[PDB]
């Protein structure tokens, strides 16, 4: 009796301003997402389409629920065979391009208001889940970001202190090389297994400061700037930012 | 002079990975991998876009 | 001519009762989806082990 | 007589993240491995 | 913001440099070396002279 019309068209640069903000601070720390203007537009048109999603919405309306028992189911049913959602382009195919995306949603009802209310109601509620689950999606990518990077630097370190470990036995040998060759003072080339050019003085304090090493970062940068990474990615959060996932062409008529 | 207490070093090497990395890091992640096990994850393998009905 | 914006299946089952239908579909779908869970969660240890086992 | 109906889709990136915590482990155990959420569907 | 962050990453490194350059001074002390030297160690140079 009353169908409540609307067109919508994916979201433009300019409603993506504060997403492209928080992207922005995780770009500075090595990741780099989006939430892509064209997806989030198909999740809404998905999610609207969802007859289980449009069915909570209606019951969890206290406007519609004033319009007795387990017919509630029923009229429940029947409401929501009154949502549609068209593709503007499926209608007259291929072969003419479409400048731009585009689909009209819709719902009638016995009355003007009702079919209108209705329809931006449900409108809002789906657009909701969608940045909901959008912000999800981008919390879950830093999630795995920090998980990576924490774990990584605890093997690099584990890997540094082998290396280490492995390059104290070699000095080792090396002054004993050295002290068997009387190179005491530093040569004025060498073994490519045990160097010694150092001489053995040089290479007893050497030996000591590799043995006195106990953070691996402490002579590694690229360590320290891991650690600092990893703190940063930890510290990071996204925020609840608020964005529509599309462009209203139209907006919900008053039939 | 030198060779040979390289030699007498090199002859008594009794551990190739005392003197390399690359050995002690892949005894490393080898003891890793036994140690890792996989949780039973729970997931969906689908979206519902519609639950099944009471018709 | 024109591919949808999503792949969907439609799942369904037939009964006696209304209930009967959704209480069957319903439970065979947990079922179904149990074993995907089940056979998946296998192959990714199935890899660790071969991982495992090579490396070693 | 009656007929009980469900439309599943492929499973989102959202529903994937217990899972995705795993994969993470093993990449760094590198072992890099993943479960496509369109051959879960699938195989359901 | 990547300023701030490459301001930061290089103090970390010059802090890394630091020590390094600490043990170089230990390292040319014990082997003698105090004037340049007009080979080197490639962890803890030396040819400068303590």
Known sequence: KWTSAAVVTPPEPVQWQELEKTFTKLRVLDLDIKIDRTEAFNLFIKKFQSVSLLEEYLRSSPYVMDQDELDLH?????????????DDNASK?????????????????????EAQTVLS??????????????????????????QFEKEKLAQDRIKMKNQLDANIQRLNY????????????????????????????????????????????????????????????????????NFTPFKYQLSPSLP
């Open 174 to 241: 090396s002054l004993d090389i050295a002290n068997a060759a009387g190179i005491k003072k530093p040569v004025y080339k060498d073994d490519p297994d045990f160097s010694i050019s150092l001489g053995a003085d040089g290479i007893e304090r050497k030996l000591e400061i590799e043995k006195a090493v106990t953070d691996v970062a402490e002579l590694n940068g690229e360590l320290r700037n891991r650690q600092y990474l990893v703190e940063q990615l930890t510290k990071a959060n996204i925020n609840d930012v």
């Open 93 to 113: 195919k291929k072969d003419e391009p479409s400048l731009y995306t585009s689909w009209t949603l819709s719902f009638t009802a016995p009355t003007s208001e």
């Open 74 to 86: 029923r009229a429940i049913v029947a409401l929501s065979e009154k949502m549609k959602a068209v």
């Open 121 to 146: 109601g449900y409108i809002d509620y789906i657009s909701a889940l969608v940045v909901k689950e959008s912000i999800e999606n981008v919390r879950n990518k830093l999630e795995i970001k920090t």
